Amino acid sequence: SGIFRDVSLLHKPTTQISDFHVATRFNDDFSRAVLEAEVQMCGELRDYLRVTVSLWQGETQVASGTAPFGGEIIDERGGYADRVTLRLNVENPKLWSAEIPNLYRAVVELHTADGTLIEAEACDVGFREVRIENGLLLLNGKPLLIRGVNRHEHHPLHGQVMDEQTMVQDILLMKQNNFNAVRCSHYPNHPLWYTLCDRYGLYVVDEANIETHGMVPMNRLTDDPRWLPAMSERVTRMVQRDRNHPSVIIWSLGNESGHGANHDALYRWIKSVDPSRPVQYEGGGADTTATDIICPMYARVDEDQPFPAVPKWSIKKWLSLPGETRPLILCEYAHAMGNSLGGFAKYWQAFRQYPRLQGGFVWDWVDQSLIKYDENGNPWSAYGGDFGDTPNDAQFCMNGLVFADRTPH
Amino acid sequence: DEANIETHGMVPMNRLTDDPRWLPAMSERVTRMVQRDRNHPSVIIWSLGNESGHGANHDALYRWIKSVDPSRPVQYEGGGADTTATDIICPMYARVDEDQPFPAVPKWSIKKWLSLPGETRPLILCEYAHAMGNSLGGFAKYWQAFRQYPRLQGGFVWDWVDQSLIKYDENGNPWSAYGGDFGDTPNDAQFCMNGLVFADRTPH
Numbered sequence: 001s002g003i004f005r006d007v008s009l010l011h012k013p014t015t016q017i018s019d020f021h022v023a024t025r026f027n028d029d030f031s032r033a034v035l036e037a038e039v040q041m042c043g044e045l046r047d048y049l050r051v052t053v054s055l056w057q058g059e060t061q062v063a064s065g066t067a068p069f070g071g072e073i074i075d076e077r078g079g080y081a082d083r084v085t086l087r088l089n090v091e092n093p094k095l096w097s098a099e100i101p102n103l104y105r106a107v108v109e110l111h112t113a114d115g116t117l118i119e120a121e122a123c124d125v126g127f128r129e130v131r132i133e134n135g136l137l138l139l140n141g142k143p144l145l146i147r148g149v150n151r152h153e154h155h156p157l158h159g160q161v162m163d164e165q166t167m168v169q170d171i172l173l174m175k176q177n178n179f180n181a182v183r184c185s186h187y188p189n190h191p192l193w194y195t196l197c198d199r200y201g202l203y204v205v206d207e208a209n210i211e212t213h214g215m216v217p218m219n220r221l222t223d224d225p226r227w228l229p230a231m232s233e234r235v236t237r238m239v240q241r242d243r244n245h246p247s248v249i250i251w252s253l254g255n256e257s258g259h260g261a262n263h264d265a266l267y268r269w270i271k272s273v274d275p276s277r278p279v280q281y282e283g284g285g286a287d288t289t290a291t292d293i294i295c296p297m298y299a300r301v302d303e304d305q306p307f308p309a310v311p312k313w314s315i316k317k318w319l320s321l322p323g324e325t326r327p328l329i330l331c332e333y334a335h336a337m338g339n340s341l342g343g344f345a346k347y348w349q350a351f352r353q354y355p356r357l358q359g360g361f362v363w364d365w366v367d368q369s370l371i372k373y374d375e376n377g378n379p380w381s382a383y384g385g386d387f388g389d390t391p392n393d394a395q396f397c398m399n400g401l402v403f404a405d406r407t408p409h
Numbered sequence: 410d411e412a413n414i415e416t417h418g419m420v421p422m423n424r425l426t427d428d429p430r431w432l433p434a435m436s437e438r439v440t441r442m443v444q445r446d447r448n449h450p451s452v453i454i455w456s457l458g459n460e461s462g463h464g465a466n467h468d469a470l471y472r473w474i475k476s477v478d479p480s481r482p483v484q485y486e487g488g489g490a491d492t493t494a495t496d497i498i499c500p501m502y503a504r505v506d507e508d509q510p511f512p513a514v515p516k517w518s519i520k521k522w523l524s525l526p527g528e529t530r531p532l533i534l535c536e537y538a539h540a541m542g543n544s545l546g547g548f549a550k551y552w553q554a555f556r557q558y559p560r561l562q563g564g565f566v567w568d569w570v571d572q573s574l575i576k577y578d579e580n581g582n583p584w585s586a587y588g589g590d591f592g593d594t595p596n597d598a599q600f601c602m603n604g605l606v607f608a609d610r611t612p613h
């Protein structure tokens with residue numbers, strides 16, 4: 001607990017850019033693209049007010065558009081006077097992917113007609129399309145093969161406080177070890193994490209900070225409408241914050257909270273506000289109505305685990321269950337606790353043989369061990385219980401591919 | 410119940426079945442079969458024939474059956490085991506785990522076939538486990554899969570009885586003969602014997 005992330009002060013003018021969304025749609029062969037930027041403002045509306053959105057590829061200005069506030073007609077009462085949408089054409093855009101993280105810079109200027117700048121915001125733009133079609137997860141029209149890993153924000157000395165050096169160290173090790181995807185288990189990450197993923201190139205699964213694993217049954221809260229408001233904020237505020245990051249290709253409703261009605265509502269909410277990214281969730285059986293992706297955790301390759309109500313079918317078998325058509329990407333697999341990862345090769349032989357088996361995220365990146373000191377003041381890695389903490393789960397907090405200090409296992 | 414239509418020897422295999430001029434001859438082999446056996450309850454599936462590739466004539470006749478008799482699924486293996494002329498994925502000799510990515514008409518591992526993008530049909534091998542001579546090795550592998558995968562609903566072993574013919578020696582004693590034993594040439598010798606039982610029905 002505590003104030004574990006940054007604290008800062010931001011000054012904004014009264015008339016300000018209060019929000020902006022960036023979308024990139026393409027033609028059949030991705031040789032043409034349209035960048036759509038919706039800008040929202042707060043403060044007093046004046047006719048002289050303007051918004052200019054310009055697109056930059058390095059130091060070269062690719063495109064620019066300007067318009068006063070006032071959107072199209074929405075309904076019987078009109079439209080948003082306090083909003084404006086700028087559309088920009090881009091010929092042969094350099095597409096974004098984990099393979100080649102091509103990025104553009106979008107600058108949003110709030111200014112007066114005479115050209116006086118009021119304020120400006122901006123973000124990195126990655127031209128890529130994510131869509132599920134005929135059962136496959138496609139990135140720019142190509143079927144992905146997720147070589148991902150689950151990663152908690154953990155430091156052996158600083159606990160759950162993240163710093164750039166560590167984020168970069170993790171990112172370099174991941175890419176150096178052929179990983180192209182990371183899942184934010186199980187909450188929105190420190191903001192810098194998304195910037196690095198956009199620039200270094202990693203497919204990200206952004207996950208809402210919702211986990212009620214300890215309840216009985218697991219969905220006791222998620223199925224309760226009285227907890228819908230609290231849950232919605234955890235999902236809605238995540239989207240409002242990271243929706244402009246191209247590295248985010250999938251939204252997650254959270255983790256291990258069974259399956260409740262609140263999940264279906266929030267699932268539909270996202271699809272409605274952001275059709276650019278698939279939505280997934282493992283609770284309630286990995287294939288409920290709240291997920292566009294069959295995303296089981298620890299489902300084996302050939303062996304079925306017929307647990308009542310929430311069985312973990314062999315992934316090969318799961319795909320062909322009567323009526324099933326969705327792609328299957330394990331949100332978690334190959335539990336790397338201690339001397340582990342035995343049988344890893346079996347998963348990859350299946351991923352490559354089956355088109356709809358599109359990889360998964362290993363559990364997990366780094367041991368959640370902590371640093372303690374003995375009488376002589378020498379450091380030693382501690383785990384559950386080594387703090388008087390009780391009850392606890394001992395060493396189950398260590399299931400990483402690397403040690404807490406990043407030395408590889 | 411299968412129509413009497415096989416043009417295996419053609420090159421390509423669908424040369425006659427994709428030819429509108431052979432449609433008349435083909436439709437009779439299909440239409441007259443249905444008019445004769447449509448009342449038997451034991452018949453649960455209509456088959457458009459065997460090894461004749463996949464031609465437009467297969468589609469027309471497939472649609473004909475679906476029209477005159479909507480009580481039975483229609484299947485046909487030609488052209489890839491999963492064309493538009495079959496309600497059932499019915500490959501012949503597709504293996505349980507190993508793919509055989511032949512060009513145009515591959516034989517995928519049956520487990521994989523079921524889940525190819527967009528596929529939703531049940532899969533029943535029209536031919537599998539070739540019982541030629543000392544064979545049936547790996548048979549148990551098929552049944553483990555059939556029982557584990559709901560959409561893998563079995564198959565038809567190939568085949569029941571060796572097609573050997575009786576011949577007699579100078580002492581008038583009988584012996585089992587096969588391809589070429591009657592001066593018949595060219596022939597394919599013993600490939601006519603692929604059964605689980607001998608021609609006299611003695612078990613293998």
Ligand code: NA
Nearest residue numbers: 351354355357
């Ligand atoms: Na695959």
Ligand code: NA
Nearest residue numbers: 396397398399
């Ligand atoms: Na654990």
Ligand code: NA
Nearest residue numbers: 555558559561
């Ligand atoms: Na079955």
Ligand code: NA
Nearest residue numbers: 600601602603
């Ligand atoms: Na034969």
